[PDB]
Structure formats: structure tokens, C-alpha cells
Amino acid sequence: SPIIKLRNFNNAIKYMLIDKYTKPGDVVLELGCGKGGDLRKYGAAGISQFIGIDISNASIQEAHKRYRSMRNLDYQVVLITGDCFGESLGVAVEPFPDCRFPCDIVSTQFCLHYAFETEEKARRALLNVAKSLKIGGHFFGTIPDSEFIRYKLNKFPKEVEKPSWGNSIYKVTFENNSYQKNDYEFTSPYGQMYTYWLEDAIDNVPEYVVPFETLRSLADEYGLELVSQMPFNKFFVQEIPKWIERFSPKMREGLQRSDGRYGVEGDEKEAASYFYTMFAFRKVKQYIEPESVKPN
Ligand SMILES: Nc1nc2c(ncn2[C@@H]2O[C@H](COP(=O)(O)OP(=O)(O)OP(=O)(O)O)[C@@H](O)[C@H]2O)c(=O)[nH]1
Ligand SMILES: Nc1ncnc2c1ncn2[C@@H]1O[C@H](C[C@@H](N)CC[C@H](N)C(=O)O)[C@@H](O)[C@H]1O
């Protein structure tokens, strides 16, 4: 693959993130789980149950096939086709009584940007996250870094009608120039759409900016406190000392620079390590909706 070094780096990121916060015995809710490419990371963590939900039935069927082909996974897997952002999770999980809610981890890997299509969907997504967790549980994930996106948008004069940037392996094209015309601020935290292309991975699929300050403010409203937010390059630098010995020779070699350090170079530096951030929140209190508590 032309992006093999990017894929290796981001899979290392996800190991570092998942295994930092997930504990043996945990129940994990994986929203937008895709084809199940993170099952092995949870095996290393020693979880007890994985609940994967994705709006695509085709990806769920592939996750089923992948689970059945894997050796020495000791946890129960529940896979569900359903929308995790545009509705509450209650109907989706009804046919699956084996699910052990409340859970210990909610994970959104490369998917929460789809929930930022509108305020109502961002709020529904985060309420689903908060409701599903134990106090002390964690919500973690990987999204494009809104601060890097703003850095890039700030380079364009307001006359540029469709701000676009990239390199040999990725490209971003914004729907419009409203940000620049609005004195270099988004007109709203939600619906800020761009098309995302990554060679051999994502074929011009629209997604939405996730202004991190808005994610944090909404999370706090729903009882979740920020523990960590770090661009991929800084997170990798922080965590790699713990992981070198754990990675096999082939995994290390797929991450290694010619100067002996581990990380990305060239066009993958921006596409993988600057473009994205991780995040982790902890549930600190139970959310009760305003005006929802009624007499008798
Ligand atoms: N901006 C953006 N990037 C994405 C999204 N989904 C995946 N990516 C990027 O595409 C890369 C490749 O993801 P995948 O195509 O699923 O490849 P993979 O990680 O090897 O997954 P598997 O083949 O299923 O094991 C990721 O590491 C991200 O950089 C998305 O929704 N938005
Ligand atoms: N509203 C939604 N509800 C549930 N899943 C969704 C929704 N919108 C998009 N998705 C899924 O989100 C996934 C996005 C992928 N980029 C990420 C998959 C996987 N978590 C990974 O890390 O590779 C796809 O599998 C989509 O089908």
C-alpha cells in the first residue's frame, strides 16, 4: 500500500490509546466499529465483552467474519447494525440482552466527526456515550484535530471559494469559504463540511470539523471530564518508550526511521501525525436531563 507507513503508525496509536485506558474485565462499546480492525487491541487489554455498533450492515458482516477467523480472543463479541449518532441506542441494543450495560469504555475511532453534522446529532452521540458508561468509565477516540484544520484554513484569503490542501497521499476540500468570510471563525461548531481523501483508504467522503472546545464543552454538560487530548505526534512521543519492547520486530521496523527513532516522515508526518488527535474523557457524574424530574 502507498500508505502502509501511515497505517502502521495509526495502528500503533490505537494500541497505545486503547491499552492505556482499557482494563482487564472491561465491557467495551465500540461506536462506528467498522470491520472490526481493533479486536486484537482489546485482546491485549484482556476485556470481557466487546459491543460493536456500525450503521453499515456490510461492515458488521465483515466484522463477524473477522472475529470468527481470529485465535485466542477470550471475550464475548456482540455486533449490531444501527445508527449510533442520529438516535438513542435503546432500540438497537434491545435484541441483544447479553450486552452488559453500563460499560467501562466507549470508543469512537475515526468516526465521531460524522456526528458533528448537526448540533442535535453531536448531542445525541455524546448523550449516548454518557448514558452507556459507569462513573469512572472512559470515553476515548481519534478525530481530526480542529486546531490543525484551523491552522490550515487560516492560510487562505477570503477570496478562496473552496479552501483545499493536501499532499501526495491526502487531500481536504472545504464546502465553502464561510469561515474566512466570518473573520476566520466557524459560523457554527456543527455542519462544517469538507471532503476527505486518503490514498487507498477514503475516497472523497465528506466529514465535519469537530471543534475540540465544543466537544469538551458538550462532554462536560453530559458529565464527562477531559483527561487527555493530544495530537498524534505528541501522543506517540509520550507513549512509545513503553511500547518498543512490546512491538514485534516487524512492527518496530514498520515504524522506524533511518535515524533509529520511531515515527513518521515525509508526507505521512502531516497526514497521520499532525492531522489527527486522540482524546480521553472520564465520566464523573450521572447526567439528568434538565426539567426531566417530575412530581409523583
Ligand atoms: N479523516 C478520516 N480519516 C479516516 C477515516 N477512517 C479512516 N481514516 C484514515 O484511514 C486510515 C486507514 O484506515 P483503514 O482504511 O480502516 O485501514 P486499517 O487501519 O489498516 O483497517 P483494517 O484494514 O480494517 O485493519 C486510518 O489510519 C486513518 O488515517 C475517517 O473517517 N476520516
Ligand atoms: N451514524 C453512524 N452510526 C454508526 N456508525 C456510523 C455512523 N456514521 C458512520 N458510521 C461508521 O463509522 C465508521 C467510520 C470509519 N472511518 C472508522 C471505522 C473503525 N472505527 C476504524 O477505526 O477504522 C464506518 O464503519 C461507518 O460505517
Residue numbers in the entry: 141 to 436
Provide the authors' original text about this structure:
The essential enzyme messenger RNA (mRNA) (guanine-N7) methyltransferase catalyzes S-adenosylmethionine (SAM)-dependent conversion of GpppRNA ends to the m7GpppRNA cap structure characteristic of eukaryal mRNAs. The antibiotic sinefungin (SFG) is a SAM analog in which the S-CH3 sulfonium moiety of SAM is replaced by a C-NH2 amine. Available evidence indicates that the antifungal activity of SFG is exerted via inhibition of fungal cap methyltransferase Abd1. Crystal structures of K. lactis and S. cerevisiae Abd1 as binary complexes with SAH or SFG and ternary complexes with GTP•SFG highlight how SFG makes two hydrogen bonds from its C-NH2 amine to the guanine-O6 and -N7 atoms of GTP that account for its higher affinity vis-à-vis SAH and SAM.
